[model samples]
Target: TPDIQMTQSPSSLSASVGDRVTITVQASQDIIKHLNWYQQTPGKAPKLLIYEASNLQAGVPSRFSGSGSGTDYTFTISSLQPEDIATYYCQQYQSLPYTFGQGTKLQIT
Candidate 1:
């Protein structure tokens, strides 16, 4: 049995609109690139930001990127935007009962 969990850091952070920021996540078990990233805005459904390790979902901004290895991963915003203010979540679907990272909230300072 696998008890996989994702530990997303800096539960909440604030930065200037143009600043670059990175979000890191550590998995309790090896999940490889079997993960996905999502962003949820106020009053809106979560949008798939990245699939696999680095592919952005259709219509996603080019400023967003993802990278990492087995057990460790990162999501980065080359330059943040006011619209980027949202709660992000990382999910691993490699095994039964997909696990999700505790939401990380990003706010514009």
Candidate 2:
């Protein structure tokens, strides 16, 4: 599990409408494509955005993207939207006790 440990940057982000937004995640060791990304809104469950790194989740908007390999990864929103204002999290499920990043909060500024 130590190898799956990850850190997410900028704990929070401020973006303008239609702006491109990106957040990063770094793992302690290689994890291949065992990572997933999620979007969480207040008072609701997290929505899976990407699974296995670059695979987009069903029904998710095309604007969201995930990319990376091994220990480094990135989650990006091509164009920020009002509904996209939420907290984003990165997760590693390569082994027992899945690990998650601290989360990055996105806000429209």
Candidate 3:
């Protein structure tokens, strides 16, 4: 089984109306760009936030963005929208039984 670790400063940090906070992902192995990001609201299914590292999934707002290379990656939600308040997760699509990061919960302060 593979694993991924996520690290963030002030795990529970505060962001202003148009500030950008970076979320980093460290994988156990090189996953190239076979990564995907998902956003899960309080009571809704996880929505695909990003795929192949930088490609935005269809219907996703333009404010959401992701970028990274090799095993280290970052997911950024530009100009955080109110509805973006949710848990964000990163997954590897390169391997079977896809593994996902523990997840980062976003809150509006």
Candidate 4:
């Protein structure tokens, strides 16, 4: 079976403007370039930040950067913005029963 499992860390965080917000994720298998990152505002659908792991979504701000490969990946906000204080998630669409990393919430100071 090639199903990919996901895990995200730092379940919660507190940061201020200009601080870096980095959410890390891992896949049980080598998902390589199959992961995606999203920003979910309370009560709103998730917004695509990165797709296929490393490619940035259209119109996304520069501060929203994505990196890493294989089983290790990172979605980072170069500078924390008030609007970025939302739950972030990592999803792997490489295999069926696509898995999602434990959503990480951002608490702005």
RMSD in Å for model 3: 2.2
Best of the candidates, TM-score: 1
Candidates' lDDT values, in order?
0.90, 0.90, 0.78, 0.87
Off by over 4 Å in 4: none
Assess candidate 1 and give its lDDT.
Answer: 0.90
Going through the candidates in the order shown, the clash numbers are 0, 0, 0, 0
Candidate 4: count of backbone clashes, pairs at least 3 residues apart or interchain: 0
Q: What does candidate 1's lDDT look like per residue over 68-108, in tens digits? A: 98999999999998989999989998787988899889987
lDDT string for model 3 (1-109, tens) is: 6444433333455666687867778877778898988889888988997999999999898898888888888888778877777888888876786787878888777
TM-score of candidate 4 versus the correct structure, residues matched by position? 0.94
* Per-residue lDDT value at 35 in model 2: 92
**lDDT ranking from best to worst?**
1, 2, 4, 3
- Supply the TM-score for candidate 2: 0.95
Candidate 4 Cα RMSD (Å): 1.1
Q: Which residue window of length 10 is worst by lDDT in model 4?
A: 1-10
* lDDT over C-alpha atoms for residue 67 of model 3: 88
Ranking by TM-score: 1, 2, 4, 3
- In order, what is each prediction's RMSD in angstroms? 0.8, 1.1, 2.2, 1.1
